[PDB]
Design an enzyme around this catalytic site. Structure first.
Site, PDB file in Angstrom:
ATOM      1  N   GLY A   7      27.077  15.730  36.606  1.00  0.00           N
ATOM      2  CA  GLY A   7      28.330  15.117  36.714  1.00  0.00           C
ATOM      3  C   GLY A   7      29.483  16.293  36.535  1.00  0.00           C
ATOM      4  O   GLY A   7      29.229  17.431  36.077  1.00  0.00           O
ATOM      5  N   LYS A   8      30.519  15.908  36.813  1.00  0.00           N
ATOM      6  CA  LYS A   8      31.705  16.591  36.547  1.00  0.00           C
ATOM      7  C   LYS A   8      32.942  16.074  36.054  1.00  0.00           C
ATOM      8  O   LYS A   8      33.185  14.792  36.465  1.00  0.00           O
ATOM      9  CB  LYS A   8      32.098  17.465  38.037  1.00  0.00           C
ATOM     10  N   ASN A  15      36.489  17.066  35.002  1.00  0.00           N
ATOM     11  CA  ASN A  15      37.708  17.781  34.894  1.00  0.00           C
ATOM     12  C   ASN A  15      37.805  19.029  34.523  1.00  0.00           C
ATOM     13  O   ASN A  15      38.282  20.103  35.223  1.00  0.00           O
ATOM     14  CB  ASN A  15      38.516  16.782  34.093  1.00  0.00           C
ATOM     15  N   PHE A  16      37.455  19.375  33.403  1.00  0.00           N
ATOM     16  CA  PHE A  16      37.477  20.705  32.757  1.00  0.00           C
ATOM     17  C   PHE A  16      35.962  21.003  32.310  1.00  0.00           C
ATOM     18  O   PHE A  16      35.812  22.219  31.641  1.00  0.00           O
ATOM     19  CB  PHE A  16      38.271  20.708  31.571  1.00  0.00           C
ATOM     20  N   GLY A  17      34.799  20.579  32.584  1.00  0.00           N
ATOM     21  CA  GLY A  17      33.579  20.638  32.412  1.00  0.00           C
ATOM     22  C   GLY A  17      32.680  19.843  33.317  1.00  0.00           C
ATOM     23  O   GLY A  17      32.632  19.062  33.703  1.00  0.00           O
ATOM     24  N   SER A  18      31.570  20.484  33.225  1.00  0.00           N
ATOM     25  CA  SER A  18      30.132  20.122  34.181  1.00  0.00           C
ATOM     26  C   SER A  18      29.160  19.860  33.216  1.00  0.00           C
ATOM     27  O   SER A  18      28.904  20.499  32.040  1.00  0.00           O
ATOM     28  CB  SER A  18      29.818  21.441  35.164  1.00  0.00           C
ATOM     29  N   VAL A  19      28.184  18.848  33.820  1.00  0.00           N
ATOM     30  CA  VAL A  19      26.826  19.014  33.220  1.00  0.00           C
ATOM     31  C   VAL A  19      25.635  18.950  34.246  1.00  0.00           C
ATOM     32  O   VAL A  19      25.749  18.251  35.260  1.00  0.00           O
ATOM     33  CB  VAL A  19      26.857  17.407  32.487  1.00  0.00           C
ATOM     34  N   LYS A  47      25.890  21.559  29.402  1.00  0.00           N
ATOM     35  CA  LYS A  47      27.441  21.453  29.646  1.00  0.00           C
ATOM     36  C   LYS A  47      27.705  22.822  29.454  1.00  0.00           C
ATOM     37  O   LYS A  47      27.527  23.822  28.562  1.00  0.00           O
ATOM     38  CB  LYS A  47      27.829  20.567  28.271  1.00  0.00           C
ATOM     39  N   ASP A  83      37.130   9.059  23.745  1.00  0.00           N
ATOM     40  CA  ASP A  83      36.683   8.989  25.159  1.00  0.00           C
ATOM     41  C   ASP A  83      35.576   8.228  25.317  1.00  0.00           C
ATOM     42  O   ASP A  83      34.695   8.135  26.063  1.00  0.00           O
ATOM     43  CB  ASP A  83      36.085  10.258  25.573  1.00  0.00           C
TER      44      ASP A  83
HETATM   45  C1  7GV Z   1      26.598  10.378  30.744  1.00  0.00           C
HETATM   46  C2  7GV Z   1      26.634  11.700  30.010  1.00  0.00           C
HETATM   47  C3  7GV Z   1      27.913  12.276  29.718  1.00  0.00           C
HETATM   48  C4  7GV Z   1      29.018  12.560  30.722  1.00  0.00           C
HETATM   49  N1  7GV Z   1      28.445  13.657  31.304  1.00  0.00           N
HETATM   50  C5  7GV Z   1      29.465  14.212  32.325  1.00  0.00           C
HETATM   51  O1  7GV Z   1      29.025  14.314  33.601  1.00  0.00           O
HETATM   52  N2  7GV Z   1      30.458  14.899  31.792  1.00  0.00           N
HETATM   53  C6  7GV Z   1      30.804  15.101  30.343  1.00  0.00           C
HETATM   54  C7  7GV Z   1      31.571  16.429  30.582  1.00  0.00           C
HETATM   55  C8  7GV Z   1      32.211  16.355  31.644  1.00  0.00           C
HETATM   56  C9  7GV Z   1      31.294  15.564  32.565  1.00  0.00           C
HETATM   57  C10 7GV Z   1      27.389  13.196  32.129  1.00  0.00           C
HETATM   58  C11 7GV Z   1      26.112  13.063  30.994  1.00  0.00           C
HETATM   59  N3  7GV Z   1      24.953  12.807  31.544  1.00  0.00           N
HETATM   60  C12 7GV Z   1      24.979  11.639  32.868  1.00  0.00           C
HETATM   61  C13 7GV Z   1      23.727  13.081  31.299  1.00  0.00           C
HETATM   62  N4  7GV Z   1      22.554  12.709  31.981  1.00  0.00           N
HETATM   63  C14 7GV Z   1      21.392  13.139  31.602  1.00  0.00           C
HETATM   64  N5  7GV Z   1      20.998  13.637  30.610  1.00  0.00           N
HETATM   65  C15 7GV Z   1      22.083  14.223  29.704  1.00  0.00           C
HETATM   66  N6  7GV Z   1      22.111  14.732  28.494  1.00  0.00           N
HETATM   67  C16 7GV Z   1      23.465  15.156  28.103  1.00  0.00           C
HETATM   68  C17 7GV Z   1      24.520  14.339  29.201  1.00  0.00           C
HETATM   69  C18 7GV Z   1      23.577  13.942  30.057  1.00  0.00           C
END
Ligand code: 7GV
Length: 276
Positions: free
Chosen positions: A14-15, A17-21, A40, A130
């Site tokens: 995921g993305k 705004n100011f951070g990626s995962v 992250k 949030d």
């Molecule tokens: C839902 C969760 C929070 C938000 N994040 C995200 O995209 N962001 C938070 C920072 C900015 C974007 C995605 C994240 N996802 C899908 C994950 N999926 C699977 N295992 C995980 N472990 C830790 C996070 C995580």
């Protein structure tokens, strides 16, 4: 710790705004039996952002609970927060993808768990700021976790609110929109929005942005609507004691919004009355 050289990029999770995962394998023996982890990191890394981020890791590190995503560590050369990887992803995606197997009693299981998670947060004077399904994670069919703490503040020891000036405005409490003031009570407002999301099954045509925009300078217009008692509608098929919780959470008066401990009890009883 984690040597960043053994950290393999698998896929972008995921993305924000100011951070990626990212989904990564930490593999110090290079035969892909290494543990898969969630990673992250910041994207337009700023001095202030790094400090915010180092504050965020401390928070999560300090947190130990069945409904909070587990800290595993950090990795440096480029500061990266390491957490456990949960395949089922965010509740928001998961709900839309498997809802035919998610009924009202199940939705209320996730809800209680979110409340317990939030009970525990207030136990450390943490304001999440949030709360939204996009930030809840799905552990297995019977368990969710709060999975991101990017806006989480610690309440000063004297105050019941923290002040901070894009924002998820269709989840924000009135006072949060006009005064930048956040609290457990502003977190309770947003929880009510999460409950709405849950009971609309994340249907695009029913989303808080969709509904408020239909009711609606955008933030100004929105301030007026909430002042005037304009509110998200009751989801289709939503039990009366459930829309009741939502409307109490959406009280304009900060002092009149329920408690997480009370929210957890009432939800648990609603869900037990439904079942047997
Ligand atoms: C839902 C969760 C929070 C938000 N994040 C995200 O995209 N962001 C938070 C920072 C900015 C974007 C995605 C994240 N996802 C899908 C994950 N999926 C699977 N295992 C995980 N472990 C830790 C996070 C995580």
């Amino acid at each position: 710790q984690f040597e960043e050289r053994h950290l393999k990029f698998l896929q972008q999770l995921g993305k924000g705004n100011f951070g990626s995962v990212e989904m990564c394998r930490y593999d110090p023996l290079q035969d892909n039996t290494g543990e898969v982890v969630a990673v992250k990191k910041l994207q337009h890394s700023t001095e202030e952002h790094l400090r915010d981020f180092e504050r965020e890791i401390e928070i999560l590190k300090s947190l130990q609970h069945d409904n909070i995503v587990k800290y595993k560590g950090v990795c440096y050369s480029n500061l990266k927060l390491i957490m456990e990887y949960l395949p089922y992803g965010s509740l928001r995606d998961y709900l839309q993808k498997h809802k035919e197997r998610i009924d009202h009693i199940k939705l209320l299981q996730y809800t209680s768990q979110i409340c317990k998670g939030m009970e525990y947060l207030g136990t450390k004077r943490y304001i999440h700021r949030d709360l939204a399904t996009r930030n809840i994670l799905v552990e297995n069919e019977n368990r969710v976790k709060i999975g991101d703490f990017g806006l989480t503040k610690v309440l000063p020891q004297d105050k019941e609110y923290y002040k901070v000036k894009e924002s998820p405005i269709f989840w924000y409490a009135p006072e949060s929109l006009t005064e930048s003031k956040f609290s457990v009570a502003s977190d309770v407002w947003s929880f009510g929005v999460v409950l709405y999301e849950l009971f609309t099954y994340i249907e695009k045509s029913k989303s808080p942005p969709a509904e408020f925009m239909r009711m609606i300078s955008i933030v100004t217009h929105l301030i007026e609507l909430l002042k005037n008692n304009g509110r998200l509608p009751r989801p289709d098929g939503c039990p009366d004691e459930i829309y009741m919780i939502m409307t109490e959470c959406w009280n304009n008066n900060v002092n009149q919004r329920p408690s997480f401990r009370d929210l957890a009890l009432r939800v648990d009883q609603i869900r037990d009355n439904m079942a047997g």
